[PDB]
Design a protein around this ligand. Sequence first.
Ligand SMILES: [Mg+2]
Ligand SMILES: [Mg+2]
Ligand SMILES: [Mg+2]
Ligand SMILES: [Mg+2]
Ligand SMILES: [Mg+2]
Ligand SMILES: [Mg+2]
Ligand SMILES: [Mg+2]
Ligand SMILES: [Mg+2]
Ligand SMILES: [Mg+2]
Ligand SMILES: [Mg+2]
Ligand SMILES: [Mg+2]
Ligand SMILES: [Mg+2]
Ligand SMILES: [Mg+2]
Ligand SMILES: [Mg+2]
Ligand SMILES: [Mg+2]
Ligand SMILES: [Mg+2]
Ligand SMILES: [Mg+2]
Ligand SMILES: [Mg+2]
Ligand SMILES: [Mg+2]
Ligand SMILES: [Mg+2]
Ligand SMILES: [Mg+2]
Ligand SMILES: [Mg+2]
Ligand SMILES: [Mg+2]
Ligand SMILES: [Mg+2]
Ligand SMILES: [Mg+2]
Ligand SMILES: [Mg+2]
Ligand SMILES: [Mg+2]
Ligand SMILES: [Mg+2]
Ligand SMILES: [Mg+2]
Ligand SMILES: [Mg+2]
Ligand SMILES: [Mg+2]
Ligand SMILES: [Mg+2]
Ligand SMILES: [Mg+2]
Ligand SMILES: [Mg+2]
Ligand SMILES: [Mg+2]
Ligand SMILES: [Mg+2]
Ligand SMILES: [Mg+2]
Ligand SMILES: [Mg+2]
Ligand SMILES: [Mg+2]
Ligand SMILES: [Mg+2]
Ligand SMILES: [Mg+2]
Ligand SMILES: [Mg+2]
Ligand SMILES: [Mg+2]
Ligand SMILES: [Mg+2]
Ligand SMILES: [Mg+2]
Ligand SMILES: [Mg+2]
Ligand SMILES: [Mg+2]
Ligand SMILES: [Mg+2]
Ligand SMILES: [Mg+2]
Ligand SMILES: [Mg+2]
Ligand SMILES: [Mg+2]
Ligand SMILES: [Mg+2]
Ligand SMILES: [Mg+2]
Ligand SMILES: [Mg+2]
Ligand SMILES: [Mg+2]
Ligand SMILES: [Mg+2]
Ligand SMILES: [Mg+2]
Ligand SMILES: [Mg+2]
Ligand SMILES: [Mg+2]
Ligand SMILES: [Mg+2]
Lengths: 202, 63
Amino acid sequence: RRPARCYRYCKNKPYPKSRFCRGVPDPKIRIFDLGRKKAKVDEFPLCGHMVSDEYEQLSSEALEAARICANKYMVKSCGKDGFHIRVRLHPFHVNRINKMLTGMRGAFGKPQGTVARVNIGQVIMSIRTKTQNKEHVIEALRRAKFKFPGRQKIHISKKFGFTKFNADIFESMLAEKRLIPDGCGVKYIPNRGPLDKWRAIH
Amino acid sequence: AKSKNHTTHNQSRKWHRNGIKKPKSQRYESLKGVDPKFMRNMRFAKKHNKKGFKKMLANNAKN
RNA sequence: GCCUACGGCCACACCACCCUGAAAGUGCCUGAUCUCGUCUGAUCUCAGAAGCGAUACAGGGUCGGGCCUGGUUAGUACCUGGAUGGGAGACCGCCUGGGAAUACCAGGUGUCGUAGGCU
RNA sequence: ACCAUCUGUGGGAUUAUGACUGAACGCCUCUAAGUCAGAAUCCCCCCUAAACGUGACGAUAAGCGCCGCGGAGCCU
RNA sequence: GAGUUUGACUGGGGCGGUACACCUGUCAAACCGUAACGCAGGUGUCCUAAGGCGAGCUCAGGGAGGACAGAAACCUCCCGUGGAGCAGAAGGGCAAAAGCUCGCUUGAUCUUGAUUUUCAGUAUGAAUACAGACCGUGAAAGCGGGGCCUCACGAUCCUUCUGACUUUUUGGGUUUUAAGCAGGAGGUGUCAGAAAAGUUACCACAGGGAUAACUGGCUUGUGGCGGCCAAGCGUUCAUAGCGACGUCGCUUUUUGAUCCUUCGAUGUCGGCUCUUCCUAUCAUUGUGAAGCAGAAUUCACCAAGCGUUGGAUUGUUCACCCACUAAUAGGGAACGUGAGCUGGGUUUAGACCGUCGUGAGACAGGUUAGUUUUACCCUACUGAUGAUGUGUUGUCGCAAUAG
RNA sequence: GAAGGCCCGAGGCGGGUGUUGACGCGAUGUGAUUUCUGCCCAGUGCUCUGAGUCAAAGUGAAGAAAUUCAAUGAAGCGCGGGUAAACGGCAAGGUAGCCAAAUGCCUCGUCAUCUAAUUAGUGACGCGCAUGAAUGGAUGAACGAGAUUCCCACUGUCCCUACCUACUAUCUAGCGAAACCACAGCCAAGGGAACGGGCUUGGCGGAAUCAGCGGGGAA
RNA sequence: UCCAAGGUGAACAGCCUCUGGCAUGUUAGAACAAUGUAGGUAAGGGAAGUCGGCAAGUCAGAUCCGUAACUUCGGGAUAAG
RNA sequence: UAUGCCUGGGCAGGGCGAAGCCAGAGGAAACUCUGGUGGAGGUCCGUAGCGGUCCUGACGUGCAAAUCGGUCGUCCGACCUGGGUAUAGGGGCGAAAGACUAAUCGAACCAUCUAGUAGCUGGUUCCCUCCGAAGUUUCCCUCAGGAUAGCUGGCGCUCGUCCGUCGCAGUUUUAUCCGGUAAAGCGAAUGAUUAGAGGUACCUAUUCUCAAACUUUAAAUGGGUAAGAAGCCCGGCUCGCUGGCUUGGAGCCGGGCGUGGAAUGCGAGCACGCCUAGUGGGCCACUUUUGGUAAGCAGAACUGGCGCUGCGGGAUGAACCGAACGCCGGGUUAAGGCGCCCGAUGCCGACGCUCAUCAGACCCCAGAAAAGGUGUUGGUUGAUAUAGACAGCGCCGAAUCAACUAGCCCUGAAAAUGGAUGGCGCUGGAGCGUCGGGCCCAUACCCGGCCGUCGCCGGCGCUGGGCUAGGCCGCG
Ligand SMILES: [Mg+2]
Ligand SMILES: [Mg+2]
Ligand SMILES: [Mg+2]
Ligand SMILES: [Mg+2]
Ligand SMILES: [Mg+2]
Ligand SMILES: [Mg+2]
Ligand SMILES: [Mg+2]
Ligand SMILES: [Mg+2]
Ligand SMILES: [Mg+2]
Ligand SMILES: [Mg+2]
Ligand SMILES: [Mg+2]
Ligand SMILES: [Mg+2]
Ligand SMILES: [Mg+2]
Ligand SMILES: [Mg+2]
Ligand SMILES: [Mg+2]
Ligand SMILES: [Mg+2]
Ligand SMILES: [Mg+2]
Ligand SMILES: [Mg+2]
Ligand SMILES: [Mg+2]
Ligand SMILES: [Mg+2]
Ligand SMILES: [Mg+2]
Ligand SMILES: [Mg+2]
Ligand SMILES: [Mg+2]
Ligand SMILES: [Mg+2]
Ligand SMILES: [Mg+2]
Ligand SMILES: [Mg+2]
Ligand SMILES: [Mg+2]
Ligand SMILES: [Mg+2]
Ligand SMILES: [Mg+2]
Ligand SMILES: [Mg+2]
Ligand SMILES: [Mg+2]
Ligand SMILES: [Mg+2]
Ligand SMILES: [Mg+2]
Ligand SMILES: [Mg+2]
Ligand SMILES: [Mg+2]
Ligand SMILES: [Mg+2]
Ligand SMILES: [Mg+2]
Ligand SMILES: [Mg+2]
Ligand SMILES: [Mg+2]
Ligand SMILES: [Mg+2]
Ligand SMILES: [Mg+2]
Ligand SMILES: [Mg+2]
Ligand SMILES: [Mg+2]
Ligand SMILES: [Mg+2]
Ligand SMILES: [Mg+2]
Ligand SMILES: [Mg+2]
Ligand SMILES: [Mg+2]
Ligand SMILES: [Mg+2]
Ligand SMILES: [Mg+2]
Ligand SMILES: [Mg+2]
Ligand SMILES: [Mg+2]
Ligand SMILES: [Mg+2]
Ligand SMILES: [Mg+2]
Ligand SMILES: [Mg+2]
Ligand SMILES: [Mg+2]
Ligand SMILES: [Mg+2]
Ligand SMILES: [Mg+2]
Ligand SMILES: [Mg+2]
Ligand SMILES: [Mg+2]
Ligand SMILES: [Mg+2]
């Protein structure tokens, strides 16, 4: 295919696979969660993200290659069931390609591939694991940067795993029955529902 | 031998060259498109308006 | 305090469930001779007043759903105008002004007019 | 007429690189200061040309050159 | 045989398409408007009701049920904001409606003017709100002069039909006929509306760089070339030599895209000849590295000084093969080089064959024969006189600088 | 078969073939000889027959008449037959032959031969893009300023140039044009209508000329 | 269009001469550079040149011999050697 | 010249050698063979003649508007040629090349129609003053062109022209509406989509990522209207419309009331009158935006600009920055500059950063990336250490180490004539960043002179000069 230099910038409007854009091939990346996904929230407290710094288009080919490069290092350094990689960029923007060139007469091209439009400060790939595996996530996410264009920086989030709550408050909300784990994440329990649900918790 | 299709580039300058002019507001605007039944009775109100000219002079004297 | 007929605004009025309801009213309820309409007096139209508050209806309740209002998100995102600003670029900062929306949190939950009527 | 015959050349700084001494950085280190070797490359010699560049020197016609602050004047 | 015609748009033209008359969503950047051979679709119809009105009714789907009967037949109940339907594309609108069903109907009728939209604010088409008639419907209020709204259509001339009247039919009168007024229809889809097949290399003219083919210029998809990351290969060992999945560049010796320069003309392919240049070094010089014992070879560095040949076939560049060789490296210079050549190719007119066309002819299909013009002008370069100012003149030298 | 075929002609008792008469004249195709000349009459065209369409004139009918209507109704068309050494195709499905050809796109087909080496040549192979039988197929002695391949011989075509001669060029006397020409004439780079000679920044630049030269003047 | 000498030779070929005619073709002198046009030679190799034996060269007259493949029986044929 | 006809002329020397004939042979016969003779033919070599192959030779402003040389075809035949005749332009003639028909032929020549037409090229002649464009809308067998609207100019005309009042506006303010773009949302509808969990493949509660032809929400900018006398207030009249009823509605009449009822600027009106030229190829930039890998690409929105425009600056250059222009003097600046070219720092400028064996040197703008560096300088977050670490061989005796990040430099970084921060050159800066003071000059700004135009409800008929009033004078 063409090099990623041709479809790196978000130059057109988002062109998703819809009833009007038919004939789109299947994306290269199909699995977004790797490792031990069916793990409790207390299993993997630490989480690290691959935050982007460019407003560009990451190809599904680069999303799959960076997924394998990060998985092959977490398996070799943290075991096959000691992490959970979640790719947080689904390729929805379809790329078009013109015919193998009467030159520009009817130049609207046919679908070529799919990219994921990333924003400045948006997470690309997230890895949660034990706290002592902090340096392994930084290196696993660093090796996957070379499989991506542009500039990305590795950030260790203050949240507890893949949840949206800080690690400092997570322990307190668990004791107060405000957070209950449901598989990979937790459910926020407000005080604004029927009281029967409150009796079931306690 | 293609050419340009549509352009409104220099048209705002041409429009404001002499200024966008609104029609001069005239008292007693034109009564075109009004209800014909309404126009019939309004013509009869003005046709027989002089019939009460004597009562108008009498009532003005009371003031 | 409450109930009718007609309404205006059209969920703060809706929905689920539970509790309670004087008096009148409303409804249920009782019949098919006539009016009228159905496969069938269930509906509809008509005739009526033995029975009760079951339901409708109204009021109240729910750490109720929704809805409504406000806070928060946030001067965040976005944006007018400006620069011989930065950067290879992608884009970003500043100047001049303008300025959001979810999640989250809190509060509220019909109201008004006309006419007649009951405590 | 390689179809006969003859001739075709020396250095300099250095590139790459390998090193010396030696810190930074108690050690180490070709490098940071300072040194060495270093090439069909580069510059130069050799070689061809000789500048609105030139040196030495010879001879320089009734004309002509030096020597009298020639001794006075006219044009630039 | 004569005359004429053989649309336009168009990333040249033709072929294709209709972006040529219309409609929906979007593009369109929150009034409207807004382009491209932008995107996704629709249209030349359909309807005596699918028009109009009134009345009743409620849909899609789901749950629970009920002989045959089942995942889908029909009956019943409950939930059901419409998730159904409304002729069609789409959007909007719509629930005791605009849907479904039923019974009465023909406002889809006869008229005048105004208004909206496309707009020049012209026409047509399609709409809006009245008014005057005559009706439909409902108990009535009302509603209705077509379809819930946004598309579903046509000038002059001519023909035809209907209607009206102190209308004409020419010196009067009568009856035919013809003409006129007014309203429909017969149609121009190139849809504001000529009556229209080619071919031309035997071609001609007006022009056009508004516009193609050849160079240059922008671009680098493609081509070529080079990094980065390290799965893996290398018996073992990621990086001696390699580099999958990815990714970042460079080049203008491929091709494409574009159409800016040139159509009162820049001679256009290759070869021959000849000079200089580039390095992304094949060989030679000096090195580093190895999965370097030697030999041979591979990788890399300084590096373009020097060299890179002779032939068969082909017009060919490009390939292929024969040998030779230290090696037989890659390119630019208007794809260097036609007032340097050579015309083989291509590229007029002759002719053959195949396919194609009824034909004339066409064919980047093959084949054969086919005029290659001018320098004495200016620079450049090659040499040849001479010019330069120190008096003239001559000999013997120096030497910048260039090679 | 002449009252004709063919053709000329504005026109006639016009004229040509024709001073002719089928062993003739006129119109075409193929192209000596030898050897064969296959299939298709649907389409187009020609030609030959006797059972819907069919002009003017004529006849009939209605009407005051104009007019209208009706019947009749030529050739030609339509219908039918024949015809391909007619156009053509292979309605018939390419027969005999021939071929990678002057005809084969793929293609520099495959094989053999020809050479150290062959996109060439020849002989073969043929589902042949798209050969083929008087749109003639196949062959073929002799012939050809025809295209092509090889061999012998020969040769400065070449390796690799050299030398000689004649006329030019050259110089002089006499004589003496033309094309061409905005101004003109040393370059590099930059920008520019994207290849300057002139502008920009640099390199720099010395009278007047001779013989050459073919880079440039997009001569 | 007409007339057409001698020699050589098969020849009205080519070459030389006689009769007759002419002054080198709209100029001369000097020089002998390049490059041309025309003519010629070249050792050794012999088409390696080139799209291609282009151009050039080889062969040539006559006499005596010798003459195939193929053929339409005529030829090929001046085969070739 | 093409062809037919008529009447004439001309065509060496040789080669092979056909029918007929003669003779001699062979044979049982039929018949065959040999020698000679003969001199046939769209025969062969070849001269003249007639042709014109190759050299793609010479020449190619030539000898020549088709020739010359060598070579070459044919040369008893469908041969060559003179003369006389025949055929004439849409015709002739053609052994066929669209050949030839007087240097002219895929339709000759001559004169006329004819100054044929051209939406197409070229050109279009004195000065000055003043104003000044358009490449866009609709329609067109249109798309190199017209018609039309717009933009332009001319000619005016109706008024106003101290405050005041009318009237006006590419602008704010106030009041009130409109919209569905950015953003957001999809634990909300439609559509797309990830992972578990719970209850029993679904189902509930969560979770990841999205929309241009999705949306509950929803800006900024933006669009419309209004901000008074054409009003307000009081009292009556008309009507055939409206109707329970002066009940509406609209029109008219009389009287009363400026604090003109937001800010600012400004003279307006006449369907912005009447006639009207040119244009209807545009192009470029910020932002927005479509196709395209991209383009000095194609196509839009908005505004400015170029075209129509010079000037200062960017070396240079249609568009960038500044600023637009009568002719001058003085002054001051803009953008940009101040080592020298080249006007200005010849300041005892300030603080740091940086060494580059391809340093770097500033809008548009005219070559760089990913990835690296134990070059150097900052910063961030950690970790060891005087119960003695780091490094080096218990000794040593003071801090040290790791990761990450950011400046400059460096690697990555290869093109062809010799060359481009503009050049020279610059390294205690003439480099990069942050600033200060001073200084340099544009046709810009200020003041002054002169010229012209334009505007003054301009002045003067009341004379030393004056008033050609179509003159003179004054002001901006
Ligand atoms: Mg245009
Ligand atoms: Mg168009
Ligand atoms: Mg609630
Ligand atoms: Mg809120
Ligand atoms: Mg070193
Ligand atoms: Mg040394
Ligand atoms: Mg014609
Ligand atoms: Mg066209
Ligand atoms: Mg809009
Ligand atoms: Mg009506
Ligand atoms: Mg152009
Ligand atoms: Mg590539
Ligand atoms: Mg790869
Ligand atoms: Mg190199
Ligand atoms: Mg060769
Ligand atoms: Mg070339
Ligand atoms: Mg040339
Ligand atoms: Mg030439
Ligand atoms: Mg050439
Ligand atoms: Mg040729
Ligand atoms: Mg030809
Ligand atoms: Mg035939
Ligand atoms: Mg037939
Ligand atoms: Mg066959
Ligand atoms: Mg050969
Ligand atoms: Mg063959
Ligand atoms: Mg046949
Ligand atoms: Mg021949
Ligand atoms: Mg020039
Ligand atoms: Mg030329
Ligand atoms: Mg002579
Ligand atoms: Mg020789
Ligand atoms: Mg050869
Ligand atoms: Mg020859
Ligand atoms: Mg032979
Ligand atoms: Mg012969
Ligand atoms: Mg001859
Ligand atoms: Mg000749
Ligand atoms: Mg020639
Ligand atoms: Mg010449
Ligand atoms: Mg011959
Ligand atoms: Mg004659
Ligand atoms: Mg004539
Ligand atoms: Mg022809
Ligand atoms: Mg002026
Ligand atoms: Mg304009
Ligand atoms: Mg033009
Ligand atoms: Mg105009
Ligand atoms: Mg016009
Ligand atoms: Mg034009
Ligand atoms: Mg553009
Ligand atoms: Mg263009
Ligand atoms: Mg112009
Ligand atoms: Mg202007
Ligand atoms: Mg510049
Ligand atoms: Mg001044
Ligand atoms: Mg300067
Ligand atoms: Mg590296
Ligand atoms: Mg660098
Ligand atoms: Mg002034």
